[PDB]
Each structure stands twice: as C-alpha cells, then as structure tokens.
Design a protein around this ligand. Structure first.
Ligand SMILES: NC(=O)C1=CN([C@@H]2O[C@H](COP(=O)(O)OP(=O)(O)OC[C@H]3O[C@@H](n4cnc5c(N)ncnc54)[C@H](O)[C@@H]3O)[C@@H](O)[C@H]2O)C=CC1
Ligand SMILES: NC(=O)C1=CN([C@@H]2O[C@H](COP(=O)(O)OP(=O)(O)OC[C@H]3O[C@@H](n4cnc5c(N)ncnc54)[C@H](O)[C@@H]3O)[C@@H](O)[C@H]2O)C=CC1
Ligand SMILES: NC(=O)C1=CN([C@@H]2O[C@H](COP(=O)(O)OP(=O)(O)OC[C@H]3O[C@@H](n4cnc5c(N)ncnc54)[C@H](O)[C@@H]3O)[C@@H](O)[C@H]2O)C=CC1
Ligand SMILES: NC(=O)C1=CN([C@@H]2O[C@H](COP(=O)(O)OP(=O)(O)OC[C@H]3O[C@@H](n4cnc5c(N)ncnc54)[C@H](O)[C@@H]3O)[C@@H](O)[C@H]2O)C=CC1
Ligand SMILES: O=C(O)Cc1ccco1
Lengths: 281, 278, 278, 278
C-alpha cells in the first residue's frame, strides 16, 4: 500500500535501465507513469518508444527533466556522466536527490562537479540490474556526503518496490557490479547453453528454454528461502551413483566454478579500470 | 474439496519436497498424506513427521491409504516395490512414478500381472517444488484415463510449472530441469566465491548472486526475446559485462553446461538399460 | 557527380579493389580514375591499366588530376606522402585516408602546414568492395563540409555497406570488418578440409562452404532476429547440427573469434601509438 | 513449367524457406504450392498462408494437388508418411525427399510396395534458400527420369547453388552446407561480441560482421584463387590482420571447423543406421 504521491521522478538517459526502472516502478504501483519524465538526444530509440507507451513524459532536453523532477536518476553511460553534470549542474536545486546508476562512477566525482555550481548536492550512488523490469532486481546504494538520512530511507523504499535493496559502503559497489550487475548476462549465457544441451538430448528448443529457466528460478528461490549452504541443497539433489552427481563431475572437470569466479573478477576489475581512466581524464 | 488421499512409497528428499509443496499450496492436508520407509532414522522422515504427514514402515498401508500413489524410491528399488505391493494396487489407484529413468512399460508389466489395467503416470520433477517453483513434466500410461492426466496436471501445477510430454523426452528433461537445481547451486556457490574474492561479505554475495539468477530467470520466462538478446541488453560496448562474458567463453562455459545435461541424461538412460537387463 | 575525378596514391590491393568496384557499379568511368605507384611494373598496376585507369609514377600527377584523393599506401608511408604532395592540395580536394590506424589529427596536422583547412575524411573498408559487398565506415575531419560526407557515403555505398561513425570507433571496426575477410578465408579453407575429410572433392567442398557462409550472412542481414534465434531455427532436437555446435563450443570457438577482433584492434592501436611516438 | 504444381508434406521451417525462395524467384506462384501439417496453428503455417500457399491438414490432399512432392518432415517421420500416402502416389509424381540422412533405397522400398517404379530424388539444401542463396545437392533414384533431374536442378537453382551428386556424398554435404549456416550464426554472434568488447554498438557490430562474412564468401566464389592466397592478400606484414590470424591459429580454429563438419556428418550417418536398424 505504498505510494509516493508528492514525488516527481526524472531519468537523464532513456535507455535500457531507464525503461526497466520505470516499468518496475509503474507495475509496482508506487509511481504513476505521468509523474515520470525521461530525456534523451535520440527520440527514435526503441526504449523511448516503450516509455512513451507506458505514459512516461519524454523530452530531448535534460534541463526539462531536471526542472520537472525531485528524484533525478542518471541513467547514461559512465563516460557521459561528466558531460551531463556540467550541462545541468546550474539547474540542481536544494530539493533534488541525484541518484547515479552509472557503473563505476564515484560519489566523489559527482559531488565535485555539482559542488562547483551549488554547495551540498544530495547524491546517492546505486548499482541495480535489468530484472527490476520484473520487480526482482538486486540493488545496492551508498549515500553521499550531503544526503540526508531520509534521502537514503526514501530511496531504499523506492528501490525495494522493484527487488532486493540494501545500503552498502561505496567501496563494495564495483564488486557488486561484477556479481549482480553483470550477473543476469551470466545467467542468460548459462540458460542458452543449458537449452542447447536439452536440444542435443532430444528436447524441442521452446520446452528446453522454459524448463531450464524454471529450474534456475526455482533453485535461486530455494536458496533465498533456505538457511542451508548451497552445497547442502546440492547434496539433496544428487543420489549416490545417480545422474546428477555424474553431471556435477563433468562440470568440475572443466573448472566450472573457476569460470564464474573469473567472470565476477573480470567485471569488477574492468569497472575499476574504466573509472581510473575517467579520474585520470 | 477433493478429499484426495496421497501416498508416497519412499520418505526421502523428493517425498518431503513434494509434501511440503502440496501442503503449502493448500491442495492437501498434511495428515491426508502417508509416507512409508524402512529407515525412520532419516532427517526427511522427521521433517515429514513434524509437518503432520502419516508415517509407517509398511508399504501396503501406504497403498491402502492412497488414492494417488507416488513412487519416490531410488530407481533400482522400483521393481522390488512393485513385486511387494502389486497385489494391493486397485482399480481406483493412480500410480505416479517419480523415479529417474524407469519406464512406464516396465511398471505396467509388473502391475499387469495382478490387476489388468493399472493406471500409471510417469513424471520428472525437481526439488524446487518445495517453494512451489518446480519444473514438472509427465507422460500418461496405457490405461491412464484422460481425467487422470488432467488431475495430475492440476496437482503438480500447484507446485510449479507442469506440462504433458511424450515419454521419450523424460530422460532429457531429467538431465536439464531434474539435475538443473544442482548446477545452479554449484554456480551460486562459485559466484559467491567471486564476490568474496572481490571484497564482498559472504552473506551479501550469496544474497546478490541468488537474486541475480532469480531475476534473470524470471526476465527470460516473461520475455519473448532470445536469451542472447537479453544478454546484449546488459553489455554496453567496452564495458564490464562484455569483459566478463569473454572470460566465460574462453573457458568453454557453454560447453560445460551442455556436457552436464548430456552426462545426466546418458547416465539416466544407462541405469535403466542395466535395470531392464536385470 | 559525373564530372568527378578520383585519384589513388598507392596502386596496390585496396586501390584495385575500390576501382574495380566503382567501375563495376557504374558510378565512375575508369578514365576518371588515376592511380600512382613508384613501381609501374606491379601486378595491380597492370590490372588497373587493363580496366582503363590512368596510371602514373608521379603522386603530384594524381593530385592534379583528382577531386577526391584516396590515400591507399601502407600506414607508415602516409606521413611521407603528405609531405610530398602537401603543397599540391587545393581547396577543391577531399583527402580520403584509407590507411589502418592513421588519425585525422595526424593528417590534418601535416597538411595544414601547407594550406589551412584541408578537407579530410578517414575511412576503413575491406577488400570485398571488389565484388561490391564491402563494409565501410568513415569519419569526417575538422574542415570537411557536410556535402563531403554525403558525397563519400554515396560513393562508398555503391560498393557495399557504408555508414558514418565517430573516429574513435574506427580501430575496432578495423578489427572486425577490416580483418574479417581474413577470418572468413581461414574458416572457409578449414571447412573445405572438413568436407574433404568426410569424402567430398575439394572443389565441391570449397563451393558448398563458401555458399553456406554467404547465404547465412545474407539471412542474418535480412532478418530482424537474433543470430542465436536463427541458430535455434537450424538445430533440430538430437540432430546433426546441434552435435556439431557442441564440438565448436567445446573448443571455445566463440572465444577465438572474440580474441581475433581484440588482437587486430589492439595491434591497430599499438601501430598508431608507434607512429605518433615519432 | 508454369503448369507445375508443388506440394510440401511438412509445413515447417524448410517448407517455408523453399516456398519463400521459389515465389520470390518467380519460378512458382504461391497458389501452385500446397503444404500440409497436422497442426494448422503453427507459425510457419500462418506465414505460408499469408504468402498465398494452399494449406491443408491432410497429406492426401497435398499428394493429389502436387506434381513435385517435397518431403519436409523430420527424418523419423518419413517412414510414417510413406506408409500414409504410398497408395496415393501416381506415375506423374516426383517425390523429393529433403530429410537429413534418409536414403533413396529406404524411400523406394516403402513406396514400391504400393506402386512399382516410384520416381524419387533425394536432396540436401539449407535454410538460406529463403534469401535465394541456398546450397543444394541432389541425387536421382532408380526410376527417376533424366528430365526429372533436370527439372529439379532448374527449380532448386532458382534459390541458390544446385548440383547433382552421387548419393554417397550427401551425408558429408549435410555436415558442411546443411549445418553450415549454424556455424556461421555462431561465428557472427561471437564476432559481434568481439566488436562490442572493443567499443562498437551491438547493432553496428552485427551488421559489420555479417557484411564482412558475406563479402568474403562472395570474393572466394568469384575468384579462381586459393582461400589461402586471398588470405595472404589481406595480411600486410606486421599488421593487425596477421596478428589476429595468429591468435585464431593458437586456438586450433581450423581444427574446430573440421571437427564440426565431421561431427555433423557422423551423427547423420548414425541416425540413419538407427533408422535402418528398425
Ligand atoms: N543495462 C544494465 O544492465 C545496467 C546498466 N547500468 C548503468 O545505467 C546506465 C545506462 O545503462 P543502459 O540504460 O544500459 O544504457 P543505454 O545505452 O540503453 O541508454 C543510454 C541512454 O543514454 C542516452 N544518452 C546519451 N547521451 C545523452 C545525453 N547527453 N543526455 C541524455 N541522455 C543521453 C542514450 O540516448 C540512451 O537512451 C549506464 O551508466 C550503466 O552502467 C546499471 C545497472 C545495470
Ligand atoms: N531428489 C531429487 O532431486 C529428485 C529425485 N527424483 C527421484 O525420486 C526418487 C527418490 O529420490 P530421493 O527422494 O532423492 O531419494 P532419497 O534417497 O532421499 O529417499 C529415498 C527413500 O526410499 C526409501 N526406501 C528404500 N527402500 C525402500 C522400500 N523397500 N520401500 C519403501 N521406501 C524405501 C529410503 O528409506 C528413503 O526414504 C529417485 O527415483 C529419484 O530419481 C526425481 C526428481 C528429482
Ligand atoms: N587490403 C586490405 O585488406 C585493406 C587495406 N587498407 C589500407 O589500405 C592501405 C594499402 O592497403 P594495400 O593496398 O593492401 O597495400 P598494398 O601494399 O597492396 O599497395 C600498397 C601500394 O602503395 C604503393 N606505394 C608505396 N610507396 C608509395 C609511395 N611513396 N607513393 C605512392 N605509392 C606508394 C606500393 O607500391 C603499392 O602499390 C593500407 O594503409 C591498409 O591499411 C584498408 C582497408 C582494407
Ligand atoms: N531446417 C534446415 O536447416 C534443413 C532441414 N532439412 C530437413 O527438412 C526436414 C524438416 O526440416 P524443418 O522444416 O527444419 O523441421 P520443422 O520441424 O521446422 O517442420 C517440421 C514439420 O513437419 C510437420 N509434421 C510432423 N508430423 C507430420 C505428419 N505426420 N504429416 C505432415 N507434416 C508433419 C510438423 O508439424 C512441422 O510443420 C528434416 O528432415 C530436415 O532434416 C534439410 C535441409 C535443411
Ligand atoms: O541424480 C539422480 O539420480 C536423481 C535425480 C533425478 C532427477 C534429478 O535428480
């Protein structure tokens, strides 16, 4: 029974993440689509067309998003953030809460830009993922220097309506990016391959996709609802000498676990490397 | 309002998961379920008992109690079971075998020596029925009535996805969604290790990794888009995700999952070939 | 335009391919093209002559003839060429650099020492322009006029795909479509070896393999569907194609192609840093 | 001929692709084509209807309509189909089996039980016939007339490359050009991932990669030169392309493509031995 009646939300950038969050928020019923505005220099993108059909207000001008909004999501690529902040920094008012969703971009770098125009900008950094579109996102956030206590509580209330949300120290966010930010892509890759395996063994593709995705969804839910270690839940599936333990062995023989560790590491490291380039630039 | 009595021959992991799912769905009262095992010292048996399920060592009592009778013992036990209680199967019974690899033909051959038209259904499910997100398929036997298949689909749809298949798909289903949760638990453990390696507390890394997988699976189930397209929507040019996807590809990540589904399916077939040789 | 004169500094593989494509397309008569090379006894020089292209050893002659001037020499020769003809560039000239890696900045710096505001365009194309199926991108320089980009796009579209990009994408395009034909020739040689191993005559295996790759590429270009969806359409359950796809996955086939694009792009960037260092 | 009526038993991917190609080519009006499938609520069935193709659930109707009858069902359904329509084949009919692996011998044996001297042709094609760039081979049966092969070659040439082969080459052709589009779709997906990793937008990377592969394939088909010579032409000394070729070689890129052709051919042979065993 949550609803932010006095909240106007804006998105700078009207791409995949802006669509995903706007769809999640509106499906959650916590925001009316007409209370959301999004801006982009390309009003002929597929994401803009979808936002328009939801009822979201669209404009090419970032200043109009700022003037309309109370909560301002920065949903542009990381290298575009500094250009955006210089463009609308003079338009940031006392009432604004600036929420950066950009991978890698630090609170410090955002506050430095905006503070040149008006002291004490209220900044929150978040990392989320596309499953907010089905209200099953994984979101962490960190509060900036001038964010009020109620700013973080409000953002946690808003982002909890589209999935899991918790506050973290900012120095964890690049690692979260490599785990749950990039995580859905790992899962889509795994599901494509599991379906290929189903097809190889005789299943129609449509059924193999549905079963593989259902298997992954159910296993993730079991772990989230259980206090047992993932190894114990695994032991419950595998009968002695059975089909599952035979399959687990061939995963182990290929270093399956190490590949997923490799992936989280590589995404985290790249996130740190890109920001180190941005700060040197 | 069915007042259906359900029995499980076998009181292990699957019987517990199904019983927990059915009672949480509200389709069955726990005390309308009876389960039998010769080993009451199992943890699964104590959980079933705590739920309020009726427990007995005697498989005949389970049969006489049941309207729908699940066979939840290990595949090599099924023929012993059918010899033992085949005389107790009645015309009213629907026999649902959950055993990996065991064919409808092998079951009907045993039971037909007693009464002539045993109603047999074969199913393959998985442990997430315990949270009502199972993936279940079933095939109907020679004498199963149209209403038997519909009843079975109503029942198993209460604990997750359920669909009828031809029996010759079920071994492949076993390798995919039957064994699938174990592949996911392995992946989630490793994803969490990667989170920990990069500085996350273990508890948070497990939570985030599992939420990521749940969300991605739901996205795919709710999308008409190809999983490759959903993947392309995550990865921006030059970005973190595409760098991570590259290291997965360099290890043959896709081939490992194909290998797993194949290995489980083949083992399922190989066991049954040895079973029907005996 | 019809009255448009085109020149090539460098009369080698790329100049031949572009001139063959342009004249085959009908957008340029061969007699409107001049090419220069210091060795007039070259195979490409002979081929260009037979087509009707004007040839000369003097790069100054090419400049004086041309309106649109392509630079088709190896990248380390570009600075030498610019110093040789810089005093000969007029305001009518559009200088189109085809050299891998060489930046508009480096070209404009050399030419601006002679006459301010050189009109420079940088492009990256590939040898299939010779059969009018090239893949070309281009970026406009500081003083290139809007019509200059439109003229270049009209010209290069006659021999394949052409689109404007920001210059900072061109090194990656080089690794993908610039080097791409070489990846395909390697793949076609190996696919033909596979056909021969399985009993096909070499000539038939080459023809079938090349036709399969051409057809598949055209399907993808004409489809809105994801390449994985088109792949799914071809793989029947249990069939030959999904069996072969597995062995590709088990070798990390995908990661090798990613490796190749990356290695070509990185080498392109490295060669240009070496150029700028001096 | 114009008065030629064509039928498809099986209204799935292949039947759609051939009918789309035939009608796009102008060799057949859609109203001269009938296709049959037991599920008239299929995506391919709908698409065929919009094109103007006559649809029916009755395979007998297709036979009665057709002069040239394509068999486009899965290989394990061919014997069932032949038993269903065998009594309906006339002397006017040319039966063209597209099924992977299925021998002319097995088809002629089933049809000869109903009427002697069935005119049978076996072909292997691929889905790029949908854009008129297929690769097709065919072998003529015992009672096929000389004009029957010439008619089939004229028809299939309208949608791509077509040549007659001895039947014992067709399983290897299946592994090369039959499965080949799937190898190319995998390669194009991975090449696009490489472009994205190096900073290209996904849509541009897909377009460039597909255009590069199409252009290279067309170059090879139009050249008399060896694919290694064309590769040599593209690799400048010390350059980006030869650096990328090295990383392909270091992964055994060539051996993976050989592996794939082999695995598809062997699986084709194995499936047909399973067919003949029963
Ligand atoms: N897609 C994902 O999986 C997630 C993305 N993010 C972050 O969200 C941000 C956007 O991600 P996507 O939405 O995937 O990018 P996207 O590329 O789909 O959308 C980017 C949007 O920015 C717009 N844009 C470019 N220049 C602009 C300007 N000067 N002013 C306003 N808009 C401008 C583009 O037109 C486009 O609509 C990135 O910083 C990314 O790291 C964070 C979590 C997950
Ligand atoms: N655990 C899983 O993930 C799934 C298992 N299955 C199938 O379910 C069946 C059992 O699986 P689990 O429950 O995991 O095995 P489990 O080993 O946990 O329990 C097996 C039960 O059979 C009982 N049992 C042994 N001999 C018996 C007899 N003569 N009469 C009655 N009960 C007897 C054991 O005491 C134990 O309670 C197997 O056929 C397996 O293939 C199917 C889907 C998934
Ligand atoms: N062939 C390819 O695959 C593509 C090549 N390119 C670029 O095009 C340029 C040339 O490529 P290729 O034609 O393959 O090289 P190539 O070596 O076949 O031709 C080079 C030509 O430059 C001539 N030349 C050398 N010094 C000269 C001078 N001082 N004045 C005039 N001409 C001189 C040589 O005599 C030769 O005719 C390179 O920068 C390459 O990066 C770009 C697109 C694709
Ligand atoms: N798609 C490809 O890549 C190529 C396929 N082929 C061969 O063509 C045949 C079909 O290929 P796809 O069209 O990909 O299969 P598909 O599964 O897309 O279409 C199969 C069609 O057969 C229909 N069907 C099933 N039982 C039937 C029956 N009793 N009577 C009539 N129709 C029935 C199905 O309803 C479906 O419409 C296979 O033998 C395959 O080997 C050969 C060349 C290339
Ligand atoms: O691993 C085994 O044999 C049991 C099983 C069947 C399906 C999933 O697990």
């Amino acid at each position: 029974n949550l609803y932010f009646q006095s909240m106007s939300v804006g998105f700078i950038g009207a791409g995949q993440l802006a669509f995903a969050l706007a769809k999640g928020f509106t499906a959650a019923g916590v925001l009316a689509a007409h209370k959301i505005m999004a801006s982009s220099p390309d009003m002929d993108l597929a994401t803009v067309s979808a936002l328009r059909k939801m009822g979201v207000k669209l404009t090419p001008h970032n200043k109009e998003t700022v003037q309309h909004s109370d909560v301002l999501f920065l949903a542009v690529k990381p290298h575009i953030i500094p250009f955006i902040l210089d463009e609308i920094g003079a338009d940031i008012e006392d009432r604004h809460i600036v929420v950066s969703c950009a991978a890698g971009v630090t609170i410090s770098s955002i506050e430095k830009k905006l503070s040149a125009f008006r002291p004490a900008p209220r900044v929150i950094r978040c990392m989320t993922n596309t499953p907010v579109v089905v209200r099953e996102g994984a979101t962490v956030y960190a509060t900036g220097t001038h964010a009020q206590v109620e700013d973080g509580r409000l953002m946690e209330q808003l982002l909890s309506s589209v999935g899991f949300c918790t506050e973290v120290e900012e120095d964890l966010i690049d690692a979260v990016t490599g785990l749950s930010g990039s995580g859905p892509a790992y899962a889509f890759t795994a599901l494509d391959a599991l379906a290929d395996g189903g097809v190889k063994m005789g299943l129609p593709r449509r059924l193999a996709v549905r079963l593989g995705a259902q298997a992954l969804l159910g296993a993730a839910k079991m772990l989230l609802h259980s206090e047992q270690h993932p190894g114990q839940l695994k032991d419950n599936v595998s009968s002695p000498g059975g089909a599952t333990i035979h399959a687990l062995h061939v995963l182990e023989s290929g270093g399956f676990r190490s590949l997923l560790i490799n992936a989280v590491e590589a995404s985290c490291i790249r996130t740190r490397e890109l920001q180190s380039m941005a700060d040197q630039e």
